[PDB]
Design a protein around this motif. Structure first.
Motif, PDB file in Angstrom:
ATOM      1  N   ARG A  17       0.817  -1.214   0.000  1.00 54.26           N
ATOM      2  CA  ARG A  17       0.000   0.000   0.000  1.00 54.26           C
ATOM      3  C   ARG A  17       0.851   1.266   0.000  1.00 54.26           C
ATOM      4  O   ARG A  17       0.678   2.137   0.847  1.00 54.26           O
ATOM      5  N   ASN A  18       1.778   1.372  -0.950  1.00 55.09           N
ATOM      6  CA  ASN A  18       2.602   2.555  -1.136  1.00 55.09           C
ATOM      7  C   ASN A  18       3.126   2.563  -2.559  1.00 55.09           C
ATOM      8  O   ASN A  18       3.070   1.549  -3.260  1.00 55.09           O
ATOM      9  N   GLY A  19       3.602   3.725  -2.989  1.00 50.54           N
ATOM     10  CA  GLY A  19       4.332   3.784  -4.231  1.00 50.54           C
ATOM     11  C   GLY A  19       5.706   4.371  -4.010  1.00 50.54           C
ATOM     12  O   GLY A  19       5.851   5.582  -3.816  1.00 50.54           O
ATOM     13  N   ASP A  20       6.726   3.516  -4.043  1.00 48.12           N
ATOM     14  CA  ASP A  20       8.087   4.008  -4.167  1.00 48.12           C
ATOM     15  C   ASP A  20       8.390   4.387  -5.601  1.00 48.12           C
ATOM     16  O   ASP A  20       9.281   5.207  -5.847  1.00 48.12           O
ATOM     17  N   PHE A  21       7.647   3.810  -6.535  1.00 45.78           N
ATOM     18  CA  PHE A  21       7.790   4.072  -7.951  1.00 45.78           C
ATOM     19  C   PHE A  21       6.909   5.263  -8.308  1.00 45.78           C
ATOM     20  O   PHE A  21       6.086   5.718  -7.509  1.00 45.78           O
ATOM     21  N   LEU A  22       7.079   5.783  -9.516  1.00 45.65           N
ATOM     22  CA  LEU A  22       6.121   6.765 -10.011  1.00 45.65           C
ATOM     23  C   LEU A  22       4.747   6.137 -10.277  1.00 45.65           C
ATOM     24  O   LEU A  22       3.740   6.769  -9.930  1.00 45.65           O
ATOM     25  N   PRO A  23       4.614   4.903 -10.862  1.00 48.52           N
ATOM     26  CA  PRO A  23       3.286   4.276 -10.818  1.00 48.52           C
ATOM     27  C   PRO A  23       3.023   3.566  -9.503  1.00 48.52           C
ATOM     28  O   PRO A  23       3.825   3.620  -8.566  1.00 48.52           O
ATOM     29  N   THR A  24       1.886   2.887  -9.446  1.00 48.14           N
ATOM     30  CA  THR A  24       1.501   2.110  -8.281  1.00 48.14           C
ATOM     31  C   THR A  24       2.240   0.775  -8.278  1.00 48.14           C
ATOM     32  O   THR A  24       2.400   0.142  -9.326  1.00 48.14           O
TER      33      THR A  24
END
Lengths: 191, 373, 50, 65, 87
Positions: A17-24
């Motif tokens: 439940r997070n985005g380290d990336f630019l997308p999900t």
């Protein structure tokens, strides 16, 4: 024309439940399933792909089936809210590969690790020495957060296929806008 | 935003080792080790005067949040607005937090408890019964939160300070201890809990003591040292005797909430010695005469008839009353807990029950063997 | 359309990129999740009636 | 011995009053009932003792034995 | 980047043309699903209707014993039958 039973294993733990990336990360892991189910389709239509979770229960959402439309309906709306449980995830995947309709297919299990594992070193090596006695090749792909050069995963890859085994590649993606280019360089053909 | 955290670094002990950790976990855009560190900052038992700085940071979270479980978000914002101590805008802020997440996670059921638990100080008549009812109707199809029943018991504890609340409170005092498994808080709050547990089970209408109560170890392990009377008055009520000395010493001991109910507790034990005295004799001659009730319950002869009609009215027994011999027939139908001492004679009656039936089968099998086939 | 202008003039850092990033962001994730779940149910019920 | 099939039920309570939570599968009583052809087809299969209706003092005592 | 009154005034107006676009046909899809379910309910009632036998209309002439009833059809012969369980 290779005959195998590719068993994909996504992660819907709470740490997704997070985005380290630019997308999900959920969109990152979902498109990761798309590029491998289409990979096993075009190589041989006589294979089968089935998804399995491991967070808080290993609920068999889709049976290992050669169809893909049941998977694509169930890749969405996964609701990741569970706690990651990895030690039972191998044994439920090998139990799925025993309940097959044909015993002439090879055995390949790919798994998606999007959360850090907290497991005993005894519990990983008992599963590793079990799959040596069962001749089972399991691929491990890391998503999202990842401790670089873990003790548990690297010794599990080593004790999986030691003394000239298959070459189950450990995918270590860096955080950033990189897509599955690390997952389609080596593991889409050289697994 | 990085300049906001450099100037808000202070007022928390050992600053840079936890504020360099907070700025790096912001840049990695994760939301779980970041969340547990903010929850660590709230759990810190300090004065926590940085509500005006964290309400811009909690605003900075919810702009690009869209990933985080609102269960932990509601659970962390209810401690912040409790620390802000502003009952004028606490309701208008909490309703804004309640309506901004109406998603498939059941955080609104914690928000409705957070409505009442901040509101149950003044004017507790207009909406409180509605928001009590709203939680229990929304406590369906998921008995796995275990916090929404916890906060529903906490508002019921605040609702205990009303005029009529004594039966549903004691039944909810069981259900809170039924869902909870750990203790995770010291003795200096649990000894008050078992005290008002002993009062709710005492000041009740349809409750005598409700056995499988004193076996529950969180009350007797903490009050065997201190005051030593509330356990002792439940010993006499489980035994069912009057024991006029001991039930007087609790009247000297507990001065409030007992002078208005001392006639009631004398009434409650006189209907309670009956189910002890029909348990004393194991249905041998259950027809008990007036003298034994008048001696045991220390009640006069002109009240033993009114005493047993009250017991037949409640449903603790289904006997009848004869007055041609002044003897009461008793068919006891309301069972309870007993000890190991009654277990022993129960087995000896069962061993007699075993050996008599088996002996008669051996007489039938020997006599009718030739016609058995 | 007066409320759409009046909420962009009095405040600048209160509900501009704050209110518009909650009721649009929580809308579209439900709309993305329900454009398909309804569709997967609608196609399956065409099979059952057939 | 005389032991029929057994059935439980799926119920979800806490446990009793103040005891920790669990499942506690409650028992539902069970019986056996056939159908019209499913009962007549049974009698053709047995053919060994067949156990006639109302008994002549020998089956009735064994029913008490 | 910052907060002006020009960019943020147009930041959502390019979105409200989209969030109502995906919301408008959602009512059409639920209406299409609701009518199809009604058409499905009409289909399943006919499946239960298809497993039907039909019953012989007859009249009781007299009662012989506690379980023997002499009945007669509208043109057929006379029968000696009983009742089900609770009639």
């Amino acid at each position: 024309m290779v005959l195998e039973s590719t068993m994909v294993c996504v992660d819907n733990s709470e740490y997704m439940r997070n985005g380290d990336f630019l997308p999900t990360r959920l969109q990152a892991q979902q498109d990761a399933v798309n590029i491998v189910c289409h990979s096993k389709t075009r190589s041989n239509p006589e294979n089968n792909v089935g998804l399995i979770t491991l967070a808080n229960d290993c609920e068999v959402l889709t049976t290992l089936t050669p169809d893909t439309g049941r998977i694509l309906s169930k890749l969405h709306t996964v609701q990741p809210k569970g706690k990651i449980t990895f030690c039972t995830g191998i044994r439920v995947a090998h139990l799925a590969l025993k309940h097959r309709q044909g015993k002439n297919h090879k055995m390949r299990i790919i798994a998606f690790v999007g959360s850090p594992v907290e497991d005993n070193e005894k519990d990983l090596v008992k599963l590793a020495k079990r799959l040596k006695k069962e001749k089972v090749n399991v691929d491990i792909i890391n998503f999202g957060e990842e401790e670089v050069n873990t003790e548990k995963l690297t010794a599990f890859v080593n004790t999986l296929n030691g003394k000239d085994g298959t070459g189950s590649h450990l995918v270590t993606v860096p955080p950033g806008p990189s897509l599955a280019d690390a997952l389609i360089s080596s593991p889409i053909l050289a697994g | 935003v990085p300049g906001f955290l450099q100037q808000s670094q202070n007022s928390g002990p050992g600053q840079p080792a936890v504020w360099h950790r907070l700025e790096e976990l912001y840049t990695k855009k994760l939301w779980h080790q970041l969340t547990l560190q903010v929850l660590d900052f709230v759990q810190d038992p300090c004065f926590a005067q940085g509500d005006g700085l964290i309400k811009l940071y909690e605003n900075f979270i919810s702009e690009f949040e869209h990933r985080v479980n609102p269960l932990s978000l509601v659970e962390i914002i209810l401690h912040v607005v409790r620390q802000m101590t502003d009952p004028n805008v606490a309701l208008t802020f909490l309703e804004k937090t309640r309506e901004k997440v109406k998603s498939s996670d059941e955080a609104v059921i914690l928000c409705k408890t957070a409505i009442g638990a901040l509101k149950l100080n003044i004017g507790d008549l207009q909406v409180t019964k509605e928001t009590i009812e709203d939680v229990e109707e929304m406590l369906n199809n998921l008995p796995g939160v275990t916090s929404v029943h916890s906060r529903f018991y906490d508002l019921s504890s605040k609702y205990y300070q009303t005029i009529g609340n004594h039966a549903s409170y004691y039944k909810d005092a069981l259900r809170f201890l039924g869902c909870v498994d750990i203790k995770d808080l010291p003795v200096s709050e649990q000894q008050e809990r078992a005290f008002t547990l002993g009062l709710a089970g005492l000041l009740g209408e349809g409750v005598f003591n409700f056995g499988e109560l004193l076996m529950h170890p969180v009350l007797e392990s903490l009050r065997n040292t201190d005051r030593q009377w509330l356990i002792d008055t439940l010993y006499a009520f489980n035994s069912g005797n009057v024991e006029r000395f001991q039930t007087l010493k609790t009247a000297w001991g507990q001065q409030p909430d007992l002078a208005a109910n001392e006639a009631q507790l004398l009434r409650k034990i006189q209907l309670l010695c009956l189910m002890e005295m029909t348990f004393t004799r194991p249905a041998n001659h259950r027809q008990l005469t007036f003298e034994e009730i008048a001696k045991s319950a220390k009640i006069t002869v002109n009240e033993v008839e009114l005493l047993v009609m009250k017991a037949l009215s409640v449903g603790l027994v289904k006997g009848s009353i004869d007055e041609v011999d002044k003897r009461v027939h008793m068919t006891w139908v309301q069972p309870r807990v007993l000890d190991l001492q009654q277990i022993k004679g129960m087995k000896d009656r069962l061993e007699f029950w075993c050996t008599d039936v088996k002996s008669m089968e051996m007489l039938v099998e020997h006599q009718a063997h030739d016609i058995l086939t | 359309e007066q409320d759409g202008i009046g909420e962009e003039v009095l405040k600048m850092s209160t509900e501009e990129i704050i209110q518009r990033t909650r009721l649009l962001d929580s809308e579209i994730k439900i709309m993305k999740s329900e454009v398909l779940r309804v569709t997967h149910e609608l196609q399956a019920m065409k099979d059952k009636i057939k | 011995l005389g032991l029929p099939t057994e059935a439980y039920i799926s119920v979800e309570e806490v446990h009793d009053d103040g005891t920790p939570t669990s499942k506690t599968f409650e028992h539902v009583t069970s019986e056996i009932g056939a159908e019209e052809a499913e009962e007549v087809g049974v009698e053709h299969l047995l053919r060994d003792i067949k156990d006639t209706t109302v008994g002549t003092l020998s089956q009735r005592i064994t029913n008490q034995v | 980047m910052a907060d002006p009154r020009d960019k943020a005034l147009q930041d959502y107006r390019k979105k409200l043309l989209e969030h109502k676009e995906i919301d408008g046909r959602l009512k059409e899809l639920r209406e299409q699903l609701k009518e199809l379910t009604k058409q499905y309910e009409k289909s399943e009632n006919d499946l239960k209707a298809l497993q039907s036998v039909g019953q012989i209309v007859g009249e009781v002439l007299k009662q012989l014993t506690e379980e023997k009833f002499i009945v007669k059809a509208t043109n057929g012969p006379r029968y000696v039958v009983g009742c089900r369980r609770q009639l």
